Amino acid sequence: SVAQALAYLQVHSPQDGTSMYDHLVKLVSKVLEDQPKNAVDLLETSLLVKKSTFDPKESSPLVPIPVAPDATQTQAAVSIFGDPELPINPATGEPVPADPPNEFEAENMLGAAAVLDCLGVGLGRELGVNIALAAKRIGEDPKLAVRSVR
Amino acid sequence: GKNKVYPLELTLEEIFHGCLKKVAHKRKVLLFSGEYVEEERQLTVDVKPGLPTGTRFVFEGEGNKTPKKEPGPVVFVLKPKPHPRFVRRGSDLVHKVTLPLHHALIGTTLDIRTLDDRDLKVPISDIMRPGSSLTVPGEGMPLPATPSARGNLVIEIDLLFPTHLTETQKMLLRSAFFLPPPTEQNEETKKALRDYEAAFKHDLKGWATVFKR
Amino acid sequence: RLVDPVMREVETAFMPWLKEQAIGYLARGVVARRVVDKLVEDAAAA
Amino acid sequence: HDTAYLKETVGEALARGCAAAISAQPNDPVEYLGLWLLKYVKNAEVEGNFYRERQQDLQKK
Amino acid sequence: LEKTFALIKPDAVRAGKAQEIMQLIELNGFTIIAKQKLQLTRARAEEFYGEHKGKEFFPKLVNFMTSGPIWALVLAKPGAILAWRALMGPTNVFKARAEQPKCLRALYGTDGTQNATHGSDSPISAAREIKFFFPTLSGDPTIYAEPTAAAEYITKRIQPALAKALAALAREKPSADKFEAITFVAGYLLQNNPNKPKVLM
Amino acid sequence: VQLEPNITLVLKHLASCGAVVSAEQQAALDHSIPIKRIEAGLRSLTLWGRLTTLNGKDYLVAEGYNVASSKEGAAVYETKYFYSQDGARWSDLQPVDSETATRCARIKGMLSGDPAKNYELELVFQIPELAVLRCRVDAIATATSVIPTDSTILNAASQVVPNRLFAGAAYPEKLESYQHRFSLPGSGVTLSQDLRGTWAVQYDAFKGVAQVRSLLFPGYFFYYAANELTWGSLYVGDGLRNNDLIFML
Amino acid sequence: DVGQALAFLQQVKTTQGASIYEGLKAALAKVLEDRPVNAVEALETSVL
């Protein structure tokens, strides 16, 4: 019980540089040392202690590492919007060899999404745009000689 | 009178952030025996963010100790290891980029990866001249005097011209480099440009969008 | 070969007073910490 | 003599700094002490400034 | 209430199992007072594993811990060291699977040395490692505040440079105002110290 | 009570005012806002507005701050601005020095499309179009950036942080209920302390949605829903200023 | 000892009607029961 409270109050908050256990100890020590005969302001003393705490920021041996979630899925999702410009060959500034898009035979998928949203069934309206762009990505691929996408 | 100097090699990330390096030193105490006695001493050197190249850290009291004379201080001279992207100059950073011609003229974005874990995408503001540079303020190494200010990253633009051009490509380039101003064009010029653009951005038979192979 | 200096003796005889003051301040810190612990227990009961 | 000068000059602050160094147990206590003294004078002055700013804000309101 | 060190090895991180381990740790009554994801270098790893220093497994052990980011945690619990030793289970992963299943080494750890966790043995090593990885985390107010140990630490620290600083202050005798003397002695200490060198441009 | 304005609620509540974005650009935004937010190390990144060009390729502009501190009586936000012709890929907007920041305010007319355009002004001075766009965004942000009062508070170390206990603004119809972003929480500076007739507020008491439009900059809208405490703002249209305000009113 | 500090902290009164000891105790009780997001700064921003 009380052990849980003590373990909670000593959690080291990084951005503040200290837990509340140290801050409470410092506030109590400052109140004890300078014996106050008059009224004290808890907020004022707290701000003063916060301003007065020593913080010897020293050079850490390791370079910091980023804590960031993986972004492969979202990057792949983004990669369907817009046209990917043809990469350049570093050896000769002329562009790399390329293939023209394919001639698949798909329906009016944006109109289909509009109809589905009108009826109140199917997927959403934004996912309709995503599906249309992904189907264009599939159909255009010269590697996959596709005569029809649906 | 004599001091032993030693290069201390760091990466740009360490100097940018501020490392706390540990270094080993071979100190030779000399005695009556023919062989000297050697020992490994550990030294902690604190390099603060943005210390300039050529900085000397001198440890007094350490060094090969002859029987009579107290050893002279040892010197560590800061030098940065070569980086794959940036070379530091004064307080800021130089990034040399090879740029195609059309990226210069039309204008695109250069994607650079900073020493800090951020990814800058800097647009080409205007027609980049041969030997021109693009400056991004507040992106170089930190100032050693104040730990908040930064230098300005300098991108030295190197242009990569195409190796081949056909006669029709040259005709298109010539027509693009002598087009009359829009308040001087005929109606035939406007219709021709409209037709050519609609035939260049054609979704199936046009070559504006091609998939690599 | 003989080598007494005044400042060495002065500093060495001054050292115990500094150590005594440091010990007093450490005792202050300890009592402050134990007061804070009592405060935590009372807060849980509250 | 010299002992009195040292005492009523720096003794209390140095004792506080040494207590802090004992409590913290850093990896380089001398640099810790020096930075502690610098922060000591700086926090005294900014403490005065903080009271001044609070008084000014109350008067303005 | 005692605090122990712990770390999640790259094998439980490359597989994206760090958060599950953290939630399991929190489920068993532990409290994570401090956590940090980091990436040891070769020298730092060799300094951390000083107790082995040339044993048979040391090459592969130091080559493994520097193959990816790890996590460092400080756990807090009344019986933190023994409870966390039990929670990890036996060191050998196959012996762990045989004897005690549903232990972090049995579930996430594989292939011997990659036991997916690392913990502290005794309070001495616990405090040493905590100070190694969290230099500013306060702790252990009883083992440093002994008058004998306090006097010994002051003795270890003051003869190198503080006595010389006091001697220089007494000989030079700057302004009687105490603030100038404090500034001068601080400058002398930060300029003359055996631990750090003198820096020049 | 919110901590950051949504990009969907803003587009929903400001759709009537014409502050709308294309559906394809809306999906692209939904995907590529977090990507740029993580690539730039910014805790807050929202769409700031959309500026019209002589082409169909309008500039979508998003702003984002990492730190926000009180400085000489001004709540200074260290904002970074990004622009994009399409919702997919973002570029940066570098700040502008004072000489060109004064030589860019004299260039008028709605911008072109290619951000590599050089305006020539009077010897001839060459100024990039991106500089002009940055100037216009800075001017609109200085004149207009609006948040409800008491929605921010000052903590220790003098940083402005969202007021988690903000209970909402009574009398949302009154302009006193709203303040600029760079006003300190203690100071009683609001939009009332601006010129008398430069802000129009229309409040629907039933649905509890107030709408504040800027008349000095006609394309700036800011909605505030009070039943659920949600406020957002968007600028749509060219960045030019409305000089002759006295005649129109 | 600690008894002296405890006896002292209960006579001193603050700007509020309660003593500083009781004020700190109530602040800690509120912090422990609510468990705020950024707790240390919430002490100066929300509880007192």
Side-chain angles (χ1 to χ4, degrees), chain F residues 224-238:
Chain F
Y224 168 77
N227 290 345
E228 79 288 358
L229 305 170
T230 304
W231 52 91
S233 62
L234 209 69
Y235 183 82
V236 174
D238 195 16

PDB file of all heavy atoms in Angstrom, chain F residues 224-238:
ATOM      1  N   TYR F 224     -15.659  27.824 -32.830  1.00  0.00           N
ATOM      2  CA  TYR F 224     -15.544  27.382 -31.444  1.00  0.00           C
ATOM      3  C   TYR F 224     -16.863  26.734 -31.048  1.00  0.00           C
ATOM      4  O   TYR F 224     -17.882  27.420 -30.937  1.00  0.00           O
ATOM      5  CB  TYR F 224     -15.206  28.548 -30.520  1.00  0.00           C
ATOM      6  CG  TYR F 224     -15.361  28.230 -29.051  1.00  0.00           C
ATOM      7  CD1 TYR F 224     -14.402  27.489 -28.380  1.00  0.00           C
ATOM      8  CD2 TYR F 224     -16.458  28.677 -28.334  1.00  0.00           C
ATOM      9  CE1 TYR F 224     -14.535  27.197 -27.043  1.00  0.00           C
ATOM     10  CE2 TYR F 224     -16.598  28.389 -26.995  1.00  0.00           C
ATOM     11  CZ  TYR F 224     -15.634  27.649 -26.355  1.00  0.00           C
ATOM     12  OH  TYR F 224     -15.771  27.361 -25.019  1.00  0.00           O
ATOM     13  N   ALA F 225     -16.848  25.420 -30.860  1.00  0.00           N
ATOM     14  CA  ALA F 225     -17.989  24.691 -30.332  1.00  0.00           C
ATOM     15  C   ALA F 225     -17.846  24.585 -28.821  1.00  0.00           C
ATOM     16  O   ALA F 225     -16.775  24.220 -28.318  1.00  0.00           O
ATOM     17  CB  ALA F 225     -18.088  23.302 -30.959  1.00  0.00           C
ATOM     18  N   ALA F 226     -18.925  24.905 -28.108  1.00  0.00           N
ATOM     19  CA  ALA F 226     -18.905  25.011 -26.656  1.00  0.00           C
ATOM     20  C   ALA F 226     -19.546  23.831 -25.945  1.00  0.00           C
ATOM     21  O   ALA F 226     -19.194  23.559 -24.793  1.00  0.00           O
ATOM     22  CB  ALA F 226     -19.607  26.299 -26.213  1.00  0.00           C
ATOM     23  N   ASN F 227     -20.488  23.134 -26.582  1.00  0.00           N
ATOM     24  CA  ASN F 227     -21.074  21.953 -25.956  1.00  0.00           C
ATOM     25  C   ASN F 227     -20.010  20.892 -25.717  1.00  0.00           C
ATOM     26  O   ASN F 227     -19.947  20.286 -24.640  1.00  0.00           O
ATOM     27  CB  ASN F 227     -22.209  21.410 -26.820  1.00  0.00           C
ATOM     28  CG  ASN F 227     -23.417  22.321 -26.826  1.00  0.00           C
ATOM     29  OD1 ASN F 227     -23.537  23.214 -25.988  1.00  0.00           O
ATOM     30  ND2 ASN F 227     -24.318  22.104 -27.775  1.00  0.00           N
ATOM     31  N   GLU F 228     -19.162  20.657 -26.711  1.00  0.00           N
ATOM     32  CA  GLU F 228     -17.882  19.995 -26.517  1.00  0.00           C
ATOM     33  C   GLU F 228     -16.806  21.003 -26.886  1.00  0.00           C
ATOM     34  O   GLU F 228     -16.847  21.594 -27.970  1.00  0.00           O
ATOM     35  CB  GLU F 228     -17.780  18.704 -27.345  1.00  0.00           C
ATOM     36  CG  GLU F 228     -17.470  18.866 -28.828  1.00  0.00           C
ATOM     37  CD  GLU F 228     -18.633  19.423 -29.624  1.00  0.00           C
ATOM     38  OE1 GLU F 228     -19.710  19.653 -29.035  1.00  0.00           O
ATOM     39  OE2 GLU F 228     -18.467  19.634 -30.843  1.00  0.00           O
ATOM     40  N   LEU F 229     -15.869  21.233 -25.972  1.00  0.00           N
ATOM     41  CA  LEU F 229     -14.952  22.362 -26.093  1.00  0.00           C
ATOM     42  C   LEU F 229     -13.974  22.073 -27.220  1.00  0.00           C
ATOM     43  O   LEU F 229     -12.969  21.389 -27.026  1.00  0.00           O
ATOM     44  CB  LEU F 229     -14.226  22.603 -24.777  1.00  0.00           C
ATOM     45  CG  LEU F 229     -15.149  22.797 -23.578  1.00  0.00           C
ATOM     46  CD1 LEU F 229     -14.356  22.795 -22.288  1.00  0.00           C
ATOM     47  CD2 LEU F 229     -15.943  24.077 -23.725  1.00  0.00           C
ATOM     48  N   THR F 230     -14.264  22.595 -28.410  1.00  0.00           N
ATOM     49  CA  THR F 230     -13.428  22.337 -29.577  1.00  0.00           C
ATOM     50  C   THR F 230     -13.336  23.596 -30.421  1.00  0.00           C
ATOM     51  O   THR F 230     -14.346  24.066 -30.945  1.00  0.00           O
ATOM     52  CB  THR F 230     -13.987  21.180 -30.406  1.00  0.00           C
ATOM     53  OG1 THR F 230     -14.112  20.017 -29.579  1.00  0.00           O
ATOM     54  CG2 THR F 230     -13.064  20.866 -31.561  1.00  0.00           C
ATOM     55  N   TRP F 231     -12.128  24.128 -30.576  1.00  0.00           N
ATOM     56  CA  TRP F 231     -11.912  25.343 -31.346  1.00  0.00           C
ATOM     57  C   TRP F 231     -10.856  25.095 -32.408  1.00  0.00           C
ATOM     58  O   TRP F 231      -9.855  24.422 -32.151  1.00  0.00           O
ATOM     59  CB  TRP F 231     -11.483  26.506 -30.451  1.00  0.00           C
ATOM     60  CG  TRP F 231     -10.321  26.193 -29.578  1.00  0.00           C
ATOM     61  CD1 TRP F 231      -9.008  26.393 -29.865  1.00  0.00           C
ATOM     62  CD2 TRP F 231     -10.366  25.624 -28.269  1.00  0.00           C
ATOM     63  NE1 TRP F 231      -8.227  25.983 -28.815  1.00  0.00           N
ATOM     64  CE2 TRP F 231      -9.040  25.507 -27.821  1.00  0.00           C
ATOM     65  CE3 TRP F 231     -11.400  25.201 -27.432  1.00  0.00           C
ATOM     66  CZ2 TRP F 231      -8.719  24.985 -26.576  1.00  0.00           C
ATOM     67  CZ3 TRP F 231     -11.081  24.686 -26.197  1.00  0.00           C
ATOM     68  CH2 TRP F 231      -9.752  24.581 -25.779  1.00  0.00           C
ATOM     69  N   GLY F 232     -11.084  25.646 -33.596  1.00  0.00           N
ATOM     70  CA  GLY F 232     -10.133  25.518 -34.679  1.00  0.00           C
ATOM     71  C   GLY F 232     -10.206  26.727 -35.586  1.00  0.00           C
ATOM     72  O   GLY F 232     -11.142  27.520 -35.520  1.00  0.00           O
ATOM     73  N   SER F 233      -9.193  26.861 -36.435  1.00  0.00           N
ATOM     74  CA  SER F 233      -9.117  28.002 -37.334  1.00  0.00           C
ATOM     75  C   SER F 233      -8.462  27.588 -38.638  1.00  0.00           C
ATOM     76  O   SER F 233      -7.629  26.680 -38.674  1.00  0.00           O
ATOM     77  CB  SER F 233      -8.334  29.158 -36.708  1.00  0.00           C
ATOM     78  OG  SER F 233      -6.997  28.778 -36.442  1.00  0.00           O
ATOM     79  N   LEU F 234      -8.846  28.269 -39.713  1.00  0.00           N
ATOM     80  CA  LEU F 234      -8.255  28.021 -41.017  1.00  0.00           C
ATOM     81  C   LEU F 234      -8.291  29.299 -41.838  1.00  0.00           C
ATOM     82  O   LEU F 234      -9.230  30.093 -41.730  1.00  0.00           O
ATOM     83  CB  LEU F 234      -8.985  26.896 -41.760  1.00  0.00           C
ATOM     84  CG  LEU F 234      -8.173  26.058 -42.748  1.00  0.00           C
ATOM     85  CD1 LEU F 234      -7.162  25.197 -42.017  1.00  0.00           C
ATOM     86  CD2 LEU F 234      -9.088  25.201 -43.594  1.00  0.00           C
ATOM     87  N   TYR F 235      -7.266  29.488 -42.659  1.00  0.00           N
ATOM     88  CA  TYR F 235      -7.232  30.574 -43.623  1.00  0.00           C
ATOM     89  C   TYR F 235      -7.321  29.987 -45.021  1.00  0.00           C
ATOM     90  O   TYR F 235      -6.477  29.175 -45.410  1.00  0.00           O
ATOM     91  CB  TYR F 235      -5.958  31.405 -43.488  1.00  0.00           C
ATOM     92  CG  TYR F 235      -5.927  32.582 -44.430  1.00  0.00           C
ATOM     93  CD1 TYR F 235      -6.586  33.757 -44.110  1.00  0.00           C
ATOM     94  CD2 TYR F 235      -5.260  32.518 -45.643  1.00  0.00           C
ATOM     95  CE1 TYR F 235      -6.573  34.835 -44.959  1.00  0.00           C
ATOM     96  CE2 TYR F 235      -5.246  33.597 -46.503  1.00  0.00           C
ATOM     97  CZ  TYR F 235      -5.903  34.751 -46.152  1.00  0.00           C
ATOM     98  OH  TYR F 235      -5.897  35.836 -46.991  1.00  0.00           O
ATOM     99  N   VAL F 236      -8.333  30.399 -45.774  1.00  0.00           N
ATOM    100  CA  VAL F 236      -8.532  29.924 -47.137  1.00  0.00           C
ATOM    101  C   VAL F 236      -8.720  31.128 -48.043  1.00  0.00           C
ATOM    102  O   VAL F 236      -9.553  31.997 -47.768  1.00  0.00           O
ATOM    103  CB  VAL F 236      -9.733  28.969 -47.245  1.00  0.00           C
ATOM    104  CG1 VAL F 236      -9.985  28.608 -48.695  1.00  0.00           C
ATOM    105  CG2 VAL F 236      -9.473  27.721 -46.428  1.00  0.00           C
ATOM    106  N   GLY F 237      -7.950  31.178 -49.119  1.00  0.00           N
ATOM    107  CA  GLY F 237      -7.931  32.313 -50.015  1.00  0.00           C
ATOM    108  C   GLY F 237      -6.550  32.937 -50.092  1.00  0.00           C
ATOM    109  O   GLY F 237      -5.615  32.548 -49.395  1.00  0.00           O
ATOM    110  N   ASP F 238      -6.445  33.927 -50.969  1.00  0.00           N
ATOM    111  CA  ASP F 238      -5.181  34.627 -51.134  1.00  0.00           C
ATOM    112  C   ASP F 238      -4.821  35.379 -49.859  1.00  0.00           C
ATOM    113  O   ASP F 238      -5.685  35.729 -49.054  1.00  0.00           O
ATOM    114  CB  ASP F 238      -5.248  35.595 -52.309  1.00  0.00           C
ATOM    115  CG  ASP F 238      -3.881  36.076 -52.734  1.00  0.00           C
ATOM    116  OD1 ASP F 238      -2.882  35.439 -52.340  1.00  0.00           O
ATOM    117  OD2 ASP F 238      -3.804  37.094 -53.452  1.00  0.00           O
TER     118      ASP F 238
END
